[PDB]
Design a protein around this ligand. Structure first.
Ligand SMILES: O=C(CO[C@H]1O[C@H](CO)[C@@H](O)[C@H](O)[C@H]1O)[C@@H](O)[C@H](O)[C@H](O)CO
Ligand SMILES: [Ca+2]
Length: 557
């Protein structure tokens, strides 16, 4: 019938430009660095790149505090450099997705400087200003990055709202003039050729009228509460109608905090809101409610979450799929086994998973090499503003010791994902000729692009091969998905089907040998690929013998 939109069959790579490639030795990656490496990304098989924020910013939160939405961050380069990136991507037939951060701006944005000057400034309701209560904050709202979500301003005596950093005042979507300004800013980039937009914390745009205090229950999970604004979808539909209706850009919502069952409201194509979702049920499936502790899970929980998420897409919706990003620990460390003897095998098995999932996959920079968490030794080793927030909220309050915080954030901190890309084994893994803004992982001597690119057996080569297979196998992108045994906690097994063709994906998550018995009436037809396998099954095989961390994709009859 109709073909599938390009984005449903594409493979995306996420670049965090601050930590990708530096070309002027200042220790921070830039545009020229990324443009120099498009041949590398093209070679991997990448169709589209999502870059983290690249706009003018004080960098209190590395790009997510934007001080001017129409200028390029001075660290990344100039507008000319940005256009050059765009041109060079097009030459390779690649597409760019930019990050859109409009839940909040920097406090150095001209809007907010105006806003805070007086209660009668024309920009006063571009943000949220309220009177304190009982000599306190307007209410009990906590901030993601520590302390109250209300900062008092001596200039007027009132408090402004900030879900995140104090230097990230929330934008007031209730004001139509603000919305119209945001819509114009979006066109500015869209008119430049941008192929896609990912929306930062898209679900927190609408605020609760009256700002009543959160219940104690709500305080336990405040992130979810902030996604329950009564006008949220009215605003997203308006944005689609006034902007995305006139372009052919793909839209991707970061739906952080929302209960899974509300996700279809964002992505159902009929609702004319967003095209794709980034959900966090999977990546935070073993994260405690405080967002820094870990809870033990098994493969059963992993696969069951996936099943739930996939079913939420339904017939008219569409999911992204990812195992890593700039806000989360490294995929091989988190979901695999980063011990030296299991790192490569487990990193390949997760690749097999990532690239055979129903949805649009995003590969986070470095995971194609099998980069790992970083061995943090003290709390001063973290740049992240969110860790400082945990220290404020849990250490300074005596709820936990600094040692307890450290033990735990070492495994969960975003900074695990932000150590410089490991290009070779020159000084600082070839990321910079100067001093990196965040220290490079010492394992760069073993884990680096230059060593993997030539080696047919490397983690890179395996990802490259999977990207080829997927590209050539329609059922592996847009096919149906079925978990064969949601209760099995050793071996992940499922099928992808399209137009009478069925493929079986089988992945041992155990560091021990395991067996797998195919469903009654199903038999192996071909073996497309395996990792950690000494021999493929035989045509006709009705069961599989699996090595530790073995993965494979098979066409069945
Ligand atoms: O609220 C969000 C959305 O993150 C987005 O919004 C944040 C602020 O703009 C930014 O820091 C992130 O990098 C961006 O992706 C959570 O991811 C939260 O920041 C925290 O990481 C969860 O424990
Ligand atoms: Ca630089």
């Amino acid at each position: 019938k109709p073909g599938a939109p390009w984005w449903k069959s594409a493979v995306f790579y996420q670049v965090y430009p601050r930590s990708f490639k530096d070309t002027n030795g200042d220790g921070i990656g830039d545009f020229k660095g990324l443009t120099e490496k498009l041949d590398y990304l093209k070679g991997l098989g990448i169709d589209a790149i999502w870059i983290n924020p690249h706009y003018a910013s004080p960098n209190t939160d590395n790009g997510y505090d934007i001080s001017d939405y129409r200028e390029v961050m001075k660290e990344y380069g100039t507008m000319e450099d940005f256009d050059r990136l765009m041109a060079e991507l097009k030459k390779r037939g690649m597409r760019l997705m930019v990050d859109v951060v409009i839940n909040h701006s920097s406090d150095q944005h001209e809007w907010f400087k105006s806003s805070r000057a007086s209660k009668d400034n024309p920009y006063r309701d571009y943000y949220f200003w309220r009177d304190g209560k009982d000599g306190h904050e307007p209410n009990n709202y906590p901030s993601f990055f520590g302390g109250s979500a209300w900062e008092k301003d001596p200039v007027t005596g009132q408090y402004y709202l900030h879900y995140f950093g104090r230097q990230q005042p929330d934008l007031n979507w209730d004001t139509p003039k603000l919305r119209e300004e945001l819509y114009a800013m979006l066109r500015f980039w869209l008119d430049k050729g941008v192929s896609g937009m990912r929306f930062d914390t898209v679900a927190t745009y609408s605020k609760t009228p009256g700002f009543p205090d959160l219940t104690p229950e709500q305080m336990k999970n405040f992130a979810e509460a902030y996604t329950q604004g009564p006008n949220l979808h009215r605003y997203l539909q308006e944005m689609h109608e006034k902007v995305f209706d006139h372009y052919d850009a793909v839209t991707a919502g970061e739906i952080f905090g929302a209960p899974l069952n509300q996700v279809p409201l964002f992505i159902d194509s009929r609702r004319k809101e967003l095209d794709m979702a980034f959900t966090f049920d999977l990546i935070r499936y073993d994260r405690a409610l405080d967002r820094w502790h870990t809870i033990p899970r098994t493969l059963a929980d992993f696969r069951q979450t996936i099943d739930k998420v996939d079913a939420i897409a339904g017939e008219y919706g569409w999911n992204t799929f990812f195992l890593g990003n700039h806000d989360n620990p490294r995929a091989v460390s988190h979901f695999g086994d980063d011990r030296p003897q299991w790192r490569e095998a487990s990193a390949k098995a997760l690749a097999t998973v990532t690239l055979t999932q129903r949805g649009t996959p995003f590969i986070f920079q470095g995971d194609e090499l099998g980069m790992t968490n970083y061995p943090f030794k003290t709390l001063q080793d973290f740049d992240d503003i969110e860790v400082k927030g945990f220290f404020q909220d849990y250490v300074e309050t005596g709820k936990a010791t600094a040692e307890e915080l450290l033990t735990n954030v070492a495994l969960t901190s975003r900074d695990n994902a932000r150590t410089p890309f490991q290009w070779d084994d020159s000084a600082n893994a070839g990321f910079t000729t100067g001093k990196p803004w965040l220290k490079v992982n010492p394992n760069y001597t073993e884990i680096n692009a230059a060593r993997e690119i030539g080696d047919p057996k490397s983690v890179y080569s395996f990802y490259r091969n999977l990207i080829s297979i997927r590209h050539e196998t329609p059922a592996l992108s847009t096919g149906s998905y079925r978990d064969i045994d949601p209760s099995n906690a050793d071996v992940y097994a499922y099928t992808r089907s399209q137009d009478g063709e069925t493929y079986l994906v089988v992945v041992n998550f155990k560091a021990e040998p395991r067996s797998f018995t195919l469903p009654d009436g199903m038999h192996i037809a071909e073996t497309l690929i395996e990792s950690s396998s000494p021999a493929a099954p035989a045509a006709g095989a009705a069961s599989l013998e699996l090595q530790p961390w073995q993965s494979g994709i098979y066409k069945v009859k």
